[PDB]
């Protein structure tokens, strides 16, 4: 079987840079006939996904021309010029004449920007969620770049895994930064069981993690 | 104008079964190899299988995650297209896709049809405001929220003081947890104007009918 590999994952970009994305393979997709069907798809958020190029390096009508695809055998190349706001969304390549048939793992383009460290903000579960016999305690960690982050939770000092869901925001249209809330939902009984609890996040930003906790005493 | 329209999404039962069709017009059918591709929320676009066109036979290929599930067929006499998925699973949960394939390859892609498989019934969230603690250092600004537990189906909306305050509002993605969802929202404003002005998440999940404002009190 051939092995497909789209990079990047995410591609930071300035308005009017070029961009280009890479669609790799194990070994030669080319056809017997001669052609090559490696395609290029964009998809725009929440909206269906449209072609772009078809056959390697044929440019489908009404796609502007700053569009283009490239490559051969293995390799392959979308290359966007002059990229604008209208570009914004996540590219796929694709190609359904070798096993695994498949799109690729996506190239969301994203605008580049400032490196901002997040602003963490832990909150105690209230007194409602409280009566009814659960206790969620909240964290978010908004605003920073570039995107990548971690978080821990920890409990009288003590690392905690289980019960905890992250939520994360698709980069501000007006600020271009990422936002994170990570909930740590515990029983009422298991909460009152410990006292410290902490969110602590790791950032390129910082060599030091931003610890903020609270004591139910 | 060449048309693809895909329907007969809805909430599935897991272990159930769900038909998905994709109607055509516009164009010879026949001609048409076609694809079935589907995109579960927060996740990356997927290609399901496609049935070629009378030329190769209307044969058919499907993914490793879905051969022997589901089914691709089509009614050559109708223009239709159909995605007969079997026992139903909470990873089938996504946005379905048709779209035709030739020369020019997937040139023309329907709107997708949206599947959701749970068991789940409606019920409304619990929302739980969301305060720093008596003890946290003060600040220039301050950042509050509400937390909208265990709801089902989607969606909720989220305001705060009626819209009144909508920058640097962050209403977070959706997460299932308990088979149900749960979605938290975070507001800023300047520690000066709170708790002298109040701070209300106006929240409604028009399924179960309901409305909560919640007051972030210290
Ligand atoms: O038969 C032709 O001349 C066109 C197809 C050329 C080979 N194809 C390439 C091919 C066909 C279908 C797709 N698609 O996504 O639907 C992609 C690539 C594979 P097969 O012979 O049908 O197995």
């Known amino acids: 079987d051939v092995l497909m590999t789209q990079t990047p994952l995410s591609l930071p970009v300035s308005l009017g840079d070029q961009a280009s994305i890479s669609c790799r393979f194990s070994?030669?997709?080319?056809?017997?006939?001669?052609?090559?069907?490696l395609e290029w798809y964009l998809q725009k958020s929440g909206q269906s996904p449209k072609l772009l190029i078809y056959?390697?390096?044929n440019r489908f009508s009404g796609v502007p021309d700053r569009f283009s695809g490239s490559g051969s055998g293995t390799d392959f190349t979308l290359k966007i010029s002059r990229v604008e706001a209208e570009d914004l969304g996540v590219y796929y390549c694709?190609?359904?004449?070798?096993?695994?048939?498949?799109f690729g793992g996506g190239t969301k383009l994203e605008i580049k920007r400032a490196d901002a460290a997040p602003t963490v903000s832990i909150f105690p579960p209230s007194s409602e969620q409280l009566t009814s016999g659960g206790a969620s305690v909240v964290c978010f960690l908004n605003n920073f770049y570039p995107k990548d982050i971690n978080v821990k939770w920890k409990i009288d000092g003590s690392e905690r895994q289980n019960g905890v869901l992250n939520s994360w925001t698709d980069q501000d249209s007006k600020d271009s930064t990422y936002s994170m809330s990570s909930t740590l939902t515990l029983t009422k009984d298991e909460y009152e069981r410990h006292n410290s609890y902490t969110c602590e996040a790791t950032h390129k930003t910082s060599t030091s993690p931003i610890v903020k906790s609270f004591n139910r005493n | 104008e060449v048309k693809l329209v895909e329907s007969g999404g809805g909430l599935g039962q897991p272990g159930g079964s769900l038909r998905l069709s994709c109607a055509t017009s516009?164009?010879?059918?026949?001609?048409?190899?076609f694809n079935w591709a589907r995109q579960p929320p927060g996740k990356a676009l997927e290609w399901l299988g496609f049935?070629?066109?009378?030329?190769?036979?209307?044969?058919?290929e499907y993914s490793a995650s879905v051969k022997g599930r589901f089914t691709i067929s089509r009614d050559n006499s109708q223009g239709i297209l159909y995605l007969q998925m079997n026992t139903l699973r909470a990873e089938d949960s996504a946005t379905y896709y048709c779209?035709?394939?030739?020369?020019?390859?997937?040139?023309?892609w329907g709107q997708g049809t949206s599947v959701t498989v749970s068991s789940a019934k409606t019920t409304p969230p619990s929302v739980y405001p969301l305060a720093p603690g008596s003890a946290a250092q003060t600040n220039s600004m301050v950042t509050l929220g509400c937390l909208v537990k265990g709801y089902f189906p989607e969606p909720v909306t989220v305001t705060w003081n009626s819209g009144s305050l909508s920058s640097g509002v962050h209403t977070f993605p959706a997460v299932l947890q308990s088979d149900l969802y749960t979605l938290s929202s975070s507001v800023t404003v300047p520690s000066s104007p709170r708790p002298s002005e109040t701070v209300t998440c106006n929240v409604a999940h028009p399924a179960s009918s309901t409305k909560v404002d919640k007051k972030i009190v210290p």
């Open positions: 779209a035709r394939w030739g020369s020019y390859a997937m040139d023309y």
């Open positions: 516009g164009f010879t059918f026949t001609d048409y190899y």
């Open positions: 049935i070629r066109n009378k030329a190769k036979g209307y044969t058919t």
């Open positions: 070994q030669s997709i080319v056809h017997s006939n001669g052609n090559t069907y």
């Open positions: 056959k390697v390096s």
């Open positions: 694709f190609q359904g004449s070798h096993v695994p048939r498949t």
